[PDB]
Amino acid sequence: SGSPGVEQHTQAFLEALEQGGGKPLEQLSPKDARAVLTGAQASVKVDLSGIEVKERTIQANGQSIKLQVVRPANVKGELPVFMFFHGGGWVLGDFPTHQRLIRDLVVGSGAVAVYVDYTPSPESHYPTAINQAYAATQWVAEHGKEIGVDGKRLAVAGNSVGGNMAAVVALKAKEAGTPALRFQLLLWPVTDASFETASYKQFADGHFLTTGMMKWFWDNYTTDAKAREQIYASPLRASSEQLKGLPPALVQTAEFDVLRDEGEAYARKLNAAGVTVTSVRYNGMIHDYGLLNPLSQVPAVKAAMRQAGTELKVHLQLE
Amino acid sequence: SGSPGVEQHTQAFLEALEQGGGKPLEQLSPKDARAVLTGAQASVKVDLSGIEVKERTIQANGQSIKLQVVRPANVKGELPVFMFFHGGGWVLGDFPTHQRLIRDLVVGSGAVAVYVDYTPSPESHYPTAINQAYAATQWVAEHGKEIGVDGKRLAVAGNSVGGNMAAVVALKAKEAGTPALRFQLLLWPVTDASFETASYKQFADGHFLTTGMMKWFWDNYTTDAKAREQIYASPLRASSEQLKGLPPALVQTAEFDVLRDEGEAYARKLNAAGVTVTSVRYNGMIHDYGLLNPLSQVPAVKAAMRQAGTELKVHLQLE
Numbered sequence: 001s002g003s004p005g006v007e008q009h010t011q012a013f014l015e016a017l018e019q020g021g022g023k024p025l026e027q028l029s030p031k032d033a034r035a036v037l038t039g040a041q042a043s044v045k046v047d048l049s050g051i052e053v054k055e056r057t058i059q060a061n062g063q064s065i066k067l068q069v070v071r072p073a074n075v076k077g078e079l080p081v082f083m084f085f086h087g088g089g090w091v092l093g094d095f096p097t098h099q100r101l102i103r104d105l106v107v108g109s110g111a112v113a114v115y116v117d118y119t120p121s122p123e124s125h126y127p128t129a130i131n132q133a134y135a136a137t138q139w140v141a142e143h144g145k146e147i148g149v150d151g152k153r154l155a156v157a158g159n160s161v162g163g164n165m166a167a168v169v170a171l172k173a174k175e176a177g178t179p180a181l182r183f184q185l186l187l188w189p190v191t192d193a194s195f196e197t198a199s200y201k202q203f204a205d206g207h208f209l210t211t212g213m214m215k216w217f218w219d220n221y222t223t224d225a226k227a228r229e230q231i232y233a234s235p236l237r238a239s240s241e242q243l244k245g246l247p248p249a250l251v252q253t254a255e256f257d258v259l260r261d262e263g264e265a266y267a268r269k270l271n272a273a274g275v276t277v278t279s280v281r282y283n284g285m286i287h288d289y290g291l292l293n294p295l296s297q298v299p300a301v302k303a304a305m306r307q308a309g310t311e312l313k314v315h316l317q318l319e
Numbered sequence: 320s321g322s323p324g325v326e327q328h329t330q331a332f333l334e335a336l337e338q339g340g341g342k343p344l345e346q347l348s349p350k351d352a353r354a355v356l357t358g359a360q361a362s363v364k365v366d367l368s369g370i371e372v373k374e375r376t377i378q379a380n381g382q383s384i385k386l387q388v389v390r391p392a393n394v395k396g397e398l399p400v401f402m403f404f405h406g407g408g409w410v411l412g413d414f415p416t417h418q419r420l421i422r423d424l425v426v427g428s429g430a431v432a433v434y435v436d437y438t439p440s441p442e443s444h445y446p447t448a449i450n451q452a453y454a455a456t457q458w459v460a461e462h463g464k465e466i467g468v469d470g471k472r473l474a475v476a477g478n479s480v481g482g483n484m485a486a487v488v489a490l491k492a493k494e495a496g497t498p499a500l501r502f503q504l505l506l507w508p509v510t511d512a513s514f515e516t517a518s519y520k521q522f523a524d525g526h527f528l529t530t531g532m533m534k535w536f537w538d539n540y541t542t543d544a545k546a547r548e549q550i551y552a553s554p555l556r557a558s559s560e561q562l563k564g565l566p567p568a569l570v571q572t573a574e575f576d577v578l579r580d581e582g583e584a585y586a587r588k589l590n591a592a593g594v595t596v597t598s599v600r601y602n603g604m605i606h607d608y609g610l611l612n613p614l615s616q617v618p619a620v621k622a623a624m625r626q627a628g629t630e631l632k633v634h635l636q637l638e
Binding site: 042043051052055096 | 357358361362363364365366367368369370371372373374392393415
């Protein structure tokens, strides 16, 4: 259905989905919901060139954690590196569904991505995945040489709940005093377990990500109300003092997205706390505009991805 | 350099490599040789759509063996399946270097590919990789339900030394009396540890795969002369009785390939032994025409890949 002002190809995409019908995502089993994203991402020819992908399993904070290391192809020597935390509402998502987005960030930045295969929900609940995410980030900082990266030049990045994860890993790194981070790339992040922002009200349905989906995503992640109030679940709830000293951020938000307002609000809180922030709203876009392969050639999406890669590159340079 | 009759795009490719210079592959460390293929495969935009890839580790014949299961996207239910053994001269190759070839076979056949991550040489020597290859093939036959396939409808496939591996797994399955195989797809296979065929003499240099490379590949695999004489290393040496009862085969050979004659000779031996064989020489082509991403849009290559997928499909049907 969409709205006046939705970018033309995105609007066509929304209409094609409406005609296709099918059950609301949140009425599916996690397995069947996962298959929706898998199938949709696979239905589109996309450019995945210019990268070399290798899996690595690490022992970090008491568990085995699987990584996918995505390196710019045909480049010798140590490279700087960004952790990549995937979206999908905690229930969905994985490496191959996100590979095109990751590839675009790697090719556009010249930096290595370290995808972390965190445990999905509801198989696990908060704070399992963020603890794995942080553990892997600390491991890369310490052991980067083993995977061809300079762990001292380290950023965090992610889309959607992965943007939540990147923001929270940055907070955990501050709390732990390690590792040092150059940059946080927050792509249309989830930042608050509340559903009353103006954007949540305006875009509740008809714009791909629905309020119904977000509540289901949060419910699968954790139904503990006290957990949801913690800054490691809802970083928007952090005080200025808690946010002070966090790494420079680029926050991209989508105009037609229930999560738009909380993402922009988080950018404002970082700014009020003295953190360097660039906050950019991509007009015409829906949530996960940079993830969804059917939208990967939309010119505004390409421009957003060029920016995301360039800003990673700018913040990951030698001194 | 090439020759009169090399297909036009292939000839341009050979000339571009000649101008680029660089050391002979066999003068590189295994690590640096592996990087040559990795980098070259990554330098080309290719279509990888229409598949879903998932890794699976199995316990088979006393070891952990890593698989990549490549399924046609958006398809429900049990599907038939082919093992995929990668090429690269035993020293080189892996899943991502071969992903486009595998994808083409999966999309074109509608069957699931099971890539087997056998141990490279010289890290291991014969018969380590073929024992892993067979073990994984027997595992899929027995446990197919666990990875969404019908293990009773099982083929083997591979390119180059992977074609050697597929042929040898078929012989091992005959010797072991299990599992039943529907089909063997031998894409420009290595079949004999000898270097005196007319094609070896004619195409020793200038056509990408050189005699120098083949001797180095064999040396890394095994320098045991007695091992090389075994049919599980050199299947061309098998007698008619040893070949009797093997599954139907499609053997594609390349016209401009040192390995052309031994591949065609193996097809003849299968035929003489009563095995159903279709043996097709793709004129104008060099070795690994179906692997190399810079050649993936050459019309003859697309036609060869359409055939390979179709023949898999034909032999993997219900009764």
